[PDB]
Motif scaffolding. Structure first.
Motif, PDB file in Angstrom:
ATOM      1  N   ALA D 187       0.803  -1.314  -0.031  1.00 34.70           N
ATOM      2  CA  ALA D 187       0.011  -0.002  -0.125  1.00 34.70           C
ATOM      3  C   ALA D 187       0.870   1.247  -0.070  1.00 34.70           C
ATOM      4  N   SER D 188       2.106   1.168   0.669  1.00 27.94           N
ATOM      5  CA  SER D 188       2.637   2.261   0.805  1.00 27.94           C
ATOM      6  C   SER D 188       3.473   2.687  -0.432  1.00 27.94           C
ATOM      7  N   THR D 189       3.879   1.833  -1.136  1.00 26.43           N
ATOM      8  CA  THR D 189       4.762   1.785  -2.459  1.00 26.43           C
ATOM      9  C   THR D 189       3.952   1.936  -3.757  1.00 26.43           C
ATOM     10  N   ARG D 216      -0.777   7.100   5.223  1.00 22.26           N
ATOM     11  CA  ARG D 216       0.447   7.658   5.656  1.00 22.26           C
ATOM     12  C   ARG D 216       1.073   7.385   7.166  1.00 22.26           C
ATOM     13  N   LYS D 217       0.280   6.771   7.943  1.00 25.28           N
ATOM     14  CA  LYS D 217       0.905   6.150   9.172  1.00 25.28           C
ATOM     15  C   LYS D 217       1.477   4.999   9.203  1.00 25.28           C
ATOM     16  N   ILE D 218       2.824   5.197   8.681  1.00 27.45           N
ATOM     17  CA  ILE D 218       3.480   3.913   8.393  1.00 27.45           C
ATOM     18  C   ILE D 218       3.843   3.245   9.781  1.00 27.45           C
ATOM     19  N   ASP D 219       4.287   3.846  10.662  1.00 31.28           N
ATOM     20  CA  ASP D 219       4.717   3.179  11.837  1.00 31.28           C
ATOM     21  C   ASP D 219       3.377   2.432  12.440  1.00 31.28           C
ATOM     22  N   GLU D 220       2.136   3.097  12.555  1.00 33.56           N
ATOM     23  CA  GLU D 220       1.183   2.446  13.406  1.00 33.56           C
ATOM     24  C   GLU D 220       0.744   1.251  11.951  1.00 33.56           C
TER      25      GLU D 220
END
Ligand SMILES: *[C@H](C[C@@H](O)[C@H](O)CO)C(=O)O
Ligand SMILES: *[C@H](C[C@@H](O)[C@H](O)CO)C(=O)O
Ligand SMILES: *[C@H](C[C@@H](O)[C@H](O)CO)C(=O)O
Ligand SMILES: *[C@H](C[C@@H](O)[C@H](O)CO)C(=O)O
Lengths: 293, 293, 293, 293
Positions: D187-189, D216-220
């Motif tokens: 999803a991020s990429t 874009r809450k990547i850490d979560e």
């Protein structure tokens, strides 16, 4: 995240390290925004360098920058320890080592002992260079946790799950991908950066991919990543470790001498063919204002 | 067919080669019927030895016998060529090289040039040491034919079809297997013998398997082959390259000192466990009159 | 030792089993000295056959001979159990199964349970068909010993050490190699023979290699083995499973119809290039009086 | 991006599809936010289903939703063509096929012809299901472009570079990963989502990882991703395909009957052991308010 260059080692025609060409290249990479330089890595032909040459490399690059991870590994642990202790006089980022290579089926115990011995004597943070295809063994997230003394890992492997696992099992480790093809992805997915061979010849590109991905311009980051991939793929046609010298000359305009046989230089015909594969990429990059020309 | 021993390199406590222990070992192997000694091979930790050390090994074994194949390969071709040239004053059987190791995906063209360069400077017959698992590449019967200058090949691969192919495409080539587990088979199927690590510690057994198979006594050959297999298997429990030292001392009576870390020596407990694993086998061999007490 | 043919399943132009061509092929193989016929194996496209078609193949071949091993395996254990039970009415040598294919990472326990379940219901001796490349898993000598109920094993693998281990750990098991390239070796080394795809088209060759090896004429056996290898190699150019049809027609003089897509028939030009590759070999075999013409 | 479930096929005690259980599960998945259902995939044991059962799966799921990708492939191309043509009367998203499995070394030409044949007869968009470890074949981005008719691809491989290449060489293709461990990364990429076996039992988790990533809450997203990774690892202890049944009943509160042997059901003890391994994860998920209780 960071872009780290595994710096190429320029050799003269009589097979000695060309210190002056190394310094020009290192100075250029830092000026173009590369964060740190990984010295004596695969791209630098570390395994082809004696311990004296590994140290020679470090001293020349140290003349330019202290932003250095100093790779010291090899198959004589006494030599690796010596190099590790010698780096005490250098104010650098860390030392590193790949796993003992060549010998198949070394025991987990012996592998863990190898690395713990290096951590014991190291005056700097120690980085795992994990490269299963080259070394014949894998030091995965769980074995890295067991060793317990790594500040970071460069994971060169075609499996980003494996890379993410270092972060999952070791949340305070720095976790880098050894891949040029994953700059956009790594920056998007919370990983710490890329130790990217292609940053030797296109540092401008690798920095911009990372910057686009950080700004969350993922479509734009991928567009530029995919052009960078085509240059990586072209470099592999005749042998990337040889081709990296030719591409550096091509894109950056200075040469880096020769590789060390059996990493043979490209010949004229190979060189022509490599350039025809990338000159249209070189045109698009100028057009996008990533390269001056 | 022949049994060739890839002789262990004994190291002192401070990590130098123990020349005198090496000579004792070499002499016993030859007196117990080993045909030739492969020096600086994997079992000898050849990749862990500097060029100068590879030369010391040759000089030391050469005091005992000229029945030597001298392994000279590495990642600095100038050094390999230098060793090949130095072997001219030794009346030995041949020199050898494994393929350049570590770096993945080297082109066939570069690999061929590496070996042709060795042949062009060699004052002796050249043997191919093919070990795909350790070196990361395969120099198969086709590529060996193309290089075109090998007198023989050692093929360490479990696939005997691959090994048979050398003889198929190179009818005059001497073709050895790098397996201890294939002595009976190799002798039975028309190949030239085995370069067998386990012949370091059990030369009597490996010579007898070969003799039985030569006399078409395949059931008895296999029975002894299968006992030997159990020793090979035991040596892998704690790591074969380390375990070979402990087994030589146990079966042959003299020690070979230490391996070179990161090939770490077995500790006392591991040594005790390994001996327990091979105790019953030593007893069966004594009672078959293959070994004496 | 034996040569066992994994018999080709000839399909009609409308993709059904051609029973009559199958009977003609099987009579010929038995007339030419083949010991037993392995039905619904890889060469016979077993995985592409429904359970009903696996039974039809059995019925057709059984018109010709009782010297049959009936392969019944698949991914619905209830269908395999039903085929095993229905074989009660046939006076055949045994039934067989490959390991459950496709699904990766199946547990040892589940694999052992699959084979024990077939052994429990089988009215005939059970043969293990071990083919790690095709099925994704390996049922090795130790796993076979654990299952405890196999009468024999066909080991299709590139590693004769692995095949020998079956004999070592299971002294009363019949142990066959699935390779055409190992007929001379297998017969020379005390194994029980070969289940050889290539015996479909050159049964005379496979029997002769075996006989020459049995007579301890290993140089003659290998000369003929190496000739056969070249045919095997030719067959792989456009895909062996398809090419086996064309070679059988060319060497044996009768038609075996079509394979089942996606094992596509060779086209005219592929067929023509194939025959061009083996026509000189056919002439040699005729000149040698091995083939009649 | 999307989360697509490769829905489990529940079987009755007597090894038939349990249509009512399938419908209940399908309905729950859609209600929990799953975007589409991939029917007759690996997780649904498609290779263990006959063509008639594959069609039976389609009809039962179609009762609940038309958001279906219908997997039809097999080793009888005629049966696959039949399923493809039969799907014309269902208003679904597409059909799909894995490559022909089991047979090693099928030629590129034959693989291409297989898919193009299916594409020529398909009344819907066609999806490539690429799963190299299961099928023995890779249909990479270049072979996909050559086939030319894929609307999308499910890539089940740990190497995300390979998955991104589909996008790079086929900019208009929907590109999904077959990994549960890559939901946040995919999803991020900039990829189109995941066909995730684990969404059968934790659909809420997989949808939330994707949503967090998208925000874009990547850490979560990674923290949740990492918990989900632990359940996947737990499922693999006794075999994931069998475990998936137990986990769905545990997390979703209804049961899915039996898998089809040789995918054997977990026994009582294995189930208890598996529950103890994921119990603490459930409590964490309750504390995160992803699950109730
Ligand atoms: C780090 C990057 C390597 O792992 C490359 O994969 C080798 O081509 C380095 O070069 O040191
Ligand atoms: C000879 C044989 C090797 O290939 C073994 O695998 C190592 O024990 C050698 O030692 O070089
Ligand atoms: C037995 C031999 C096989 O394993 C071959 O690989 C297929 O041609 C058989 O055909 O069933
Ligand atoms: C889709 C996901 C698969 O490719 C998994 O890798 C199987 O482990 C499916 O279950 O159809």
């Amino acid at each position: 995240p960071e872009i780290i260059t595994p710096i190429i080692t320029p050799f003269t025609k009589d097979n000695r390290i060309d210190k002056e060409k190394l310094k020009i290249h290192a100075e250029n990479l830092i000026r173009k925004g590369i964060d740190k330089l990984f010295v004596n890595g695969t791209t630098g032909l570390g395994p082809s360098l004696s311990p004296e040459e590994k140290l020679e490399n470090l001293k020349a690059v140290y003349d330019v920058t202290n932003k250095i991870i100093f790779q010291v590994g090899g198959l004589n642990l006494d030599d690796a320890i010596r190099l590790a202790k010698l780096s005490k006089d250098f104010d650098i980022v860390g030392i590193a080592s790949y796993a003992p290579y060549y010998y198949p089926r070394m025991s987990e115990k012996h592998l863990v002992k190898y690395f713990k011995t290096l951590c014991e004597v190291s005056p700097h943070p120690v980085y795992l260079y994990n490269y299963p295809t080259a070394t014949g063994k894998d030091i995965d997230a769980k074995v890295a946790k067991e060793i317990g003394c790594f500040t970071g890992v460069k994971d060169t492997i075609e499996n980003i799950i494996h890379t993410l696992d270092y972060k999952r099992l070791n949340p305070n480790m720095l976790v880098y991908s050894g891949s040029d093809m994953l700059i956009a992805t790594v920056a998007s997915t919370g990983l710490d950066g890329n130790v990217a061979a292609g940053s030797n010849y296109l540092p401008e590109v690798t920095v911009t991919i990372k910057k686009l991905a950080m700004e969350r311009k993922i479509d734009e980051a991928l567009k530029l990543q995919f052009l960078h991939d085509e240059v990586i793929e072209a470099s592999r046609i005749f042998g990337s470790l040889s081709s990296n010298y030719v591409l550096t000359k091509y894109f950056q305009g200075y040469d880096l001498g020769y590789p060390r046989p059996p990493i043979f230089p490209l010949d004229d015909e190979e060189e022509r063919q490599l350039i025809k594969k990338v000159e249209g990429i070189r045109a698009k990059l100028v057009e996008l204002k990533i390269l001056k020309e």
